[PDB]
Amino acid sequence: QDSLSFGFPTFPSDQKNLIFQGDAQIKNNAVQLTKTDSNGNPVASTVGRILFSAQVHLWEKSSSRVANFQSQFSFSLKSPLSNGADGIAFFIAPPDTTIPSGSGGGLLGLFAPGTAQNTSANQVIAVEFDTFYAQDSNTWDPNYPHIGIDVNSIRSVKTVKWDRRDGQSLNVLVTFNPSTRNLDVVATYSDGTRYEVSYEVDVRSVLPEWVRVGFSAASGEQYQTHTLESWSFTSTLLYT
Amino acid sequence: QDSLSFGFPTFPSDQKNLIFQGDAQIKNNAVQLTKTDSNGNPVASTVGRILFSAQVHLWEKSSSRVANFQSQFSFSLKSPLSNGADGIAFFIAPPDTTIPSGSGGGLLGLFAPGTAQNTSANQVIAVEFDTFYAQDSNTWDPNYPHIGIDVNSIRSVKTVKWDRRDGQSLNVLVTFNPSTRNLDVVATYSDGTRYEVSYEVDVRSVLPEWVRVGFSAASGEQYQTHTLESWSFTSTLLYT
Numbered sequence: 001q002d003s004l005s006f007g008f009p010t011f012p013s014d015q016k017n018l019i020f021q022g023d024a025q026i027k028n029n030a031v032q033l034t035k036t037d038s039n040g041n042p043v044a045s046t047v048g049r050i051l052f053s054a055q056v057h058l059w060e061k062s063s064s065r066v067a068n069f070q071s072q073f074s075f076s077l078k079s080p081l082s083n084g085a086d087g088i089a090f091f092i093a094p095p096d097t098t099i100p101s102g103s104g105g106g107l108l109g110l111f112a113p114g115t116a117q118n119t120s121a122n123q124v125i126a127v128e129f130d131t132f133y134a135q136d137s138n139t140w141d142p143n144y145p146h147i148g149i150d151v152n153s154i155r156s157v158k159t160v161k162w163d164r165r166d167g168q169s170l171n172v173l174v175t176f177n178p179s180t181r182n183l184d185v186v187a188t189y190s191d192g193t194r195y196e197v198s199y200e201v202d203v204r205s206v207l208p209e210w211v212r213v214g215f216s217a218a219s220g221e222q223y224q225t226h227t228l229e230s231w232s233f234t235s236t237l238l239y240t
Numbered sequence: 241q242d243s244l245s246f247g248f249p250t251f252p253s254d255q256k257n258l259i260f261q262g263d264a265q266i267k268n269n270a271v272q273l274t275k276t277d278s279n280g281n282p283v284a285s286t287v288g289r290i291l292f293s294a295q296v297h298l299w300e301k302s303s304s305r306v307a308n309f310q311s312q313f314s315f316s317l318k319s320p321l322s323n324g325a326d327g328i329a330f331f332i333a334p335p336d337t338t339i340p341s342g343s344g345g346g347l348l349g350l351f352a353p354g355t356a357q358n359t360s361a362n363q364v365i366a367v368e369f370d371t372f373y374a375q376d377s378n379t380w381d382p383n384y385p386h387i388g389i390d391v392n393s394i395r396s397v398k399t400v401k402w403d404r405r406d407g408q409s410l411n412v413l414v415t416f417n418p419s420t421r422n423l424d425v426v427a428t429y430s431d432g433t434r435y436e437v438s439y440e441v442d443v444r445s446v447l448p449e450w451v452r453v454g455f456s457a458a459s460g461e462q463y464q465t466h467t468l469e470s471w472s473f474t475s476t477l478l479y480t
């Protein structure tokens with residue numbers, strides 16, 4: 001299809017169009033990307049991802065068209081600790097994507113350790129919300145929590161300082177304009193605190209014509225719950 | 241998802257979200273539901289269907305919500321014969337639906353001969369554009385080409401006279417309003433000729449909560465091409 005839209009105001013346990021990978025599962029009408037114990041507390045060493053089953057037509061070579069897209073979603077992070085890890089990310093990747101071996105912790109379940117920073121070895125665009133930046137393990141991160149745009153690498157091509165607020169929902173709007181090639185990210189807390197970061201990228205030279213969209217989250221030795229609360233997505237092929 | 245939408249202004253051969261069954265296949269940017277020779281001429285004894293891969297949430301029990309959906313589409317039929325058969329249908333069925341054994345010809349690839357008229361044996365709602373009505377074989381049909389609403393039976397719960405126009409595209413809009421439980425059908429030819437038929441049905445008592453939507457067509461001894469040219473669909477769960 002030239003256009004596709006779907007909306008999850010909430011996440012009932014009765015799902016048919018979601019691909020669950022790793023420890024991701026539905027709980028309390030929300031998607032718990034990372035594993036939690038009996039009483040609902042986050043645990044260490046866990047990775048989880050979900051992908052919408054239907055493939056998205058990002059660009060069409062024959063017609064020379066590129067899709068414009070918009071992903072709106074909200075999530076919250078909670079942890080008994082203070083410095084919870086590792087973060088949640090919205091990503092777009094080839095349809096057959098799976099969790100890479102050893103992609104836990106700071107790799108957010110998106111990259112393989114050996115190729116995490118090799119751009120020519122990956123096919124992924126992700127918008128990460130990174131809460132852990134210890135320079136001993138996450139050498140690629142600036143030293144402060146942040147939102148980043150990742151293009152084939154765990155080392156963001158662009159970042160903005162971000163504030164982690166335990167148990168507070170973050171509203172996010174991600175949009176890609178094929179006419180200007182800008183991928184814009186707008187994130188805001190209920191009180192109006194706003195964060196913005198954008199980057200110009202030609203998706204055609206990064207991803208195949210058909211892709212899949214979803215979320216990924218992980219917790220290494222440090223942990224926190226990565227709760228996806230709602231999600232709407234729409235894509236339309238356009239001639240620029 | 242509570243809401244789902246997709247649009248096929250045309251059907252390029254590169255498809256990822258369509259489930260092809262029987263002889264259905266993409267040709268010249270359109271879906272040829274029934275088999276055609278190398279010259280593009282229709283042949284006898286053929287059945288084909290397509291379904292959108294993503295499942296539609298028609299209604300939700302624990303929520304008392306029912307979907308409001310719309311399906312807009314256009315198709316054309318051609319045959320050198322004076323009595324092209326058998327017809328094309330838009331249908332809604334359980335996710336695992338497949339072509340019933342011996343469902344060709346007048347059964348349009350939707351019903352099995354043994355239970356074609358046993359409403360308690362089927363789970364399907366379809367809008368048929370029936371062009372073959374020989375009273376000796378299709379005993380269940382009125383004596384003329386027609387548009388019919390089928391609810392668990394090949395014997396339409398309602399029909400209205402329709403005119404078959406070789407090689408001319410018919411534009412159809414099928415909508416369901418959960419408040420009035422009205423399934424409305426509006427079809428038009430490019431010259432303004434219009435056909436309408438409506439029927440009150442509670443989909444909850446006929447179909448499961450999750451379903452797949454698509455088209456079916458067949459040709460027995462008489463044949464014709466059943467070409468699906470475009471299709472857009474949208475559905476949203478509403479309170480009732």
Ligand SMILES: CO[C@H]1O[C@H](CO)[C@@H](O)[C@H](O[C@H]2O[C@H](CO)[C@@H](O)[C@H](O)[C@@H]2O)[C@@H]1O
Nearest residue numbers: 085086104105106132134137219220221222
């Ligand atoms: C106390 O944990 C920190 O220090 C350890 C000793 O160097 C590291 O092994 C540890 O790294 C792991 O956990 C973090 C946080 O969950 C994660 O980002 C990293 O990829 C490892 O899984 C952490 O730095």
Ligand SMILES: OC[C@H]1O[C@H](O)[C@@H](O)[C@@H](O)[C@@H]1O
Nearest residue numbers: 325345346377459460461462
């Ligand atoms: O194709 C016209 C006609 O052909 C045969 O008689 C049978 O397959 C019927 O079901 C069908 O209606």
Ligand SMILES: [Ca+2]
Nearest residue numbers: 106130132138
């Ligand atoms: Ca990090």
Ligand SMILES: [Ca+2]
Nearest residue numbers: 346370372378
């Ligand atoms: Ca008939």
Ligand SMILES: [Mn+2]
Nearest residue numbers: 128130141148
């Ligand atoms: Mn980072």
Ligand SMILES: [Mn+2]
Nearest residue numbers: 370381388396
């Ligand atoms: Mn009929």
